[PDB]
Enzyme design. Structure first.
Site: not given
Lengths: 509, 510
Positions: A135, A52, A20
């Site tokens: 994902e 991200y 993450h």
């Protein structure tokens, strides 16, 4: 059930972990536990996760936080889905049409029927088109059982811009892998800019400048002169050599670029890295500075990259009074360098990621105004190991005026692979045209249409190539010389050469 | 057993079809149809059948025979196939694997099992991509029952070249390009004539090197000749219509003319088939045809005649400068005949139904970019239900890295909102989220949160996601644009910022 869940990609595993990406400031706090601020996302690829991690307030140029590893204790069932439509998902798995998806996935009821004895279920999806990444979608309530580890914190390295993030992503490939030391490039860039400001011939060229708002055309000729003068300097030695023949790396392009930059950057923009990057990112011609053309990154050494950026920098500083509204020329050495550096890193990252080249799979081959592609992935595969026929469809069109298709070159193999003459044909806006096929040698056959073929805006063709296999023998690598089917466009002359449109194929069982 | 498409299979009394017939066989074939895929082909479209009527020895320029209608008496079964692989067709239907398909199709065992009571079975296949026509495959033995009738004989009309064939095919659309080539031919000669035996034009025709000269110098002189020739009264209309569009500039007529002079040798000039074959592989013909940007601009007999005339004279001038033809009759003879055939081929293509760029899976090519809907379904926005839909767009560029600034999307309160969380873009697999904000009440603009560049070796998949809060169907008079605007690089024309617009056209359906 079986129509949305891909069982082959579904599985159970102990200590299921994933990654993450985390924004600046949440890297240490998230380690205390996964908490809701409708799903908690994670991925199997720690490098995709790093992408991200950029500050949501400054997405283009902001700082990157980090990546953390999340691990579920005990057993976890990973449920792969063939679709991402929730309502569809519900109607098949006989779930509460009213209650949210990720709400039900966290209940024991769902865990029994879909978990296979696992403590919880995590949904899976294809990460993206052109990616083999996965994902994961986790239930907030179940996610509370995740133990969190620091995979990497980009800020603690103390690097400039997004250098840490990009050096990390470059690890995936460590052709070739572009793994540049941007510290050195930053250092060399500054040094060269400096040397190129206090010099003999270069400083002379600066004093031979209008230094007043002038038309584009005049701004450009002086800039090309500057580019030429500047490039003769010893510190731009290598750049001079590697930019002398490819039209895309010419002075005229460095000037077009520099002019363009000066036109769109004002005082407010110059004063902000995020706004500068926004403005520069939509400009054309950047490939000239990056030395990126014909599908490859030619400027791939720290030395040459620093030279190109330094030269563009100096040039922007010159194009500013001549074209820009800006009065503070400092932008050329500060934010312009910071911003363009970031753009280089984005494009390099792209070339480092596995991707199909033009004419491979369904990626079109664009050349001389034409666009050709395999209709489907299966079309680009010539199956072998059996006697019989196969058909392969190729899409063909052109951008504007009527360009002709003279024919196609097809591979053959004395004995096995043969072109089926009667089934090979081409259709233009539906008009079926038969072809005349003749061997040019033992391994290559040339098929020409029996009626003139032209394609263009509003006119497309489907080339249907058919193969005949005489024996069930498998086609070995050596047997087929080439690896592409050559569609031929217009002929141009003191020697005749045809526009070559290539469609690459793979040989499989 | 999914090689037969029962939905498109049917039985019919007096099943008829059309067969293209070569020159000299139009009369004979009427006496009767006579002999793995050994077949007698036919089609449901008499115009497509006209396209197989050209002489086998000179397929490019040769003459066309005609079309005949074949009809089977009694009831006939039309069996529609989903594949054209005979072996597959044999294994799935459970037939012998050693005997030829069409041989077995004509037997009573097959005729009883699949004929649904018919006297014989005919196989059917899709005619081709971009075509709605049907190709029929007939068993020779069964084909002996066919009654044959004349639909049209192209030679009986006595027209020049392939005019009769193209005049006939043009009936299908009779915007339709339906030119009278007799008139065009007659006016071409008349114009070529006036342009050679004149004052002002012959003045320039005298200032010629008239000897193998440089290619650049050949062009220059030809551009002036073109400039001068275009001032003659018989070329006034052409002057006006070719005035601003760069594709129709004298320079292109020059480039074209030079290219012709370079590839035609006495042997070739002496044979129309060889002339057509040589000319059919050259670029730049759209300059002479007046075709650009998806439309046929030269669509009147007068203007077409002027362009060909002007082109003929230029070829006549280009020969001595670059070619080795001791004769110059070619420019007025086989050059005019051959180019005429080529105009007809290209016109016929624009007359046939086809999807324009950005429609269905046809790519939209512009500014170095190439974009397309991933599948036909992606280009369709379904309406009449609450829910989500996904739409994938392929994006790449020809060479150097060009950017994608964002995408302009249509929005309708309740019936079509952008799902901001599921809308994203991937570049060589790197997934990039987007920032979507309304520009106005009807359009929403989504920017990528990380710079996006595409080029040779770098492609992107733009995934547009829509949300529907209402079940009410979207009505036609409710969306202004029928396209999704992907935006490329920004350019400053003078001092005004304009975006490279890349369009994907969609259809609204229930």
């Amino acid at each position: 059930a079986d129509d949305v869940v891909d069982s082959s990609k579904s599985f159970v595993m102990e200590n299921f972990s994933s990654y993450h990406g985390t924004k600046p400031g949440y890297v240490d706090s998230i380690q205390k536990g996964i908490q809701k601020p409708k799903e908690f996302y994670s991925t199997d690829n720690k490098y995709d996760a790093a992408g991200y991690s950029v500050d949501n307030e400054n997405p283009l140029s902001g700082k990157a936080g980090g990546v953390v590893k999340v691990t579920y204790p005990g057993l976890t069932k990973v449920l792969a889905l063939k679709v991402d439509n929730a309502e569809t998902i519900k109607k098949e798995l006989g779930l509460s049409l009213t209650e949210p998806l990720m709400e039900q996935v966290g209940t024991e009821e769902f865990i029994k029927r879909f978990g296979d004895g696992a403590s919880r279920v995590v949904l899976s999806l294809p990460f993206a088109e052109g990616s083999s990444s996965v994902e994961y979608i986790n239930n907030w309530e179940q996610a509370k059982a995740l133990s969190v580890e620091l995979e990497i914190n980009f800020e603690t390295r103390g690097k400039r811009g997004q250098d840490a993030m990009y050096e990390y992503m470059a690890q995936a490939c460590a052709l070739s892998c572009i793994n540049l030391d941007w510290d050195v490039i930053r250092d060399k860039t500054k040094t060269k800019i400096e040397s190129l400001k206090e010099h003999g011939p270069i400083k002379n060229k600066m004093s031979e400048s209008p230094n007043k708002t002038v038309s584009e055309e005049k701004a450009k000729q002086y800039l090309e002169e500057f580019h030429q003068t500047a490039l003769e300097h010893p510190e731009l030695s290598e750049l001079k050599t590697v930019t002398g023949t490819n039209p895309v790396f010419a002075g005229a392009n460095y000037a077009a670029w520099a002019v363009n930059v000066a036109q769109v950057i004002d005082s407010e923009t110059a004063d902000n890295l995020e706004k500068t990057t926004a403005a520069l990112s939509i400009l054309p011609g950047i490939g000239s500075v990056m030395g990126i053309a014909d599908g490859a990154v030619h400027h791939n050494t720290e030395e040459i990259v620093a030279q190109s950026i330094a030269l563009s920098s100096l040039m922007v500083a010159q194009a500013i009074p001549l074209v820009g509204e800006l009065v503070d020329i400092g932008f050329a050495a500060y934010n312009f360098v910071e911003s363009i550096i970031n753009l280089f890193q984005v494009v390099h990252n792209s070339y480092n990621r596995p991707a199909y080249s033009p004419g491979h799979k369904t990626q079109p081959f664009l050349h001389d105004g034409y666009a050709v592609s395999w209709n489907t992935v299966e079309d680009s595969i010539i199956r072998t190991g059996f006697q019989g026929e196969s058909g392969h469809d190729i899409k063909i069109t052109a951008e504007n005026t009527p360009l002709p298709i003279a024919g196609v070159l097809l591979p053959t193999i004395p004995g096995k692979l043969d072109v089926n003459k009667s089934k090979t044909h081409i259709s233009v806006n539906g008009r079926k045209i038969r072809m005349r096929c003749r061997a040019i040698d033992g391994d290559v056959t040339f098929c020409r249409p029996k009626s003139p073929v032209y394609v263009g805006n509003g006119v497309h063709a489907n080339l249907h190539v058919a193969f005949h296999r005489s024996s069930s023998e498998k086609i070995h690598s050596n047997e087929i010389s080439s690896d592409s089917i050559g569609v031929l466009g217009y002929q141009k002359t003191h020697t005749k050469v045809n526009s070559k449109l290539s469609l690459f194929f793979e040989i499989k069982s």
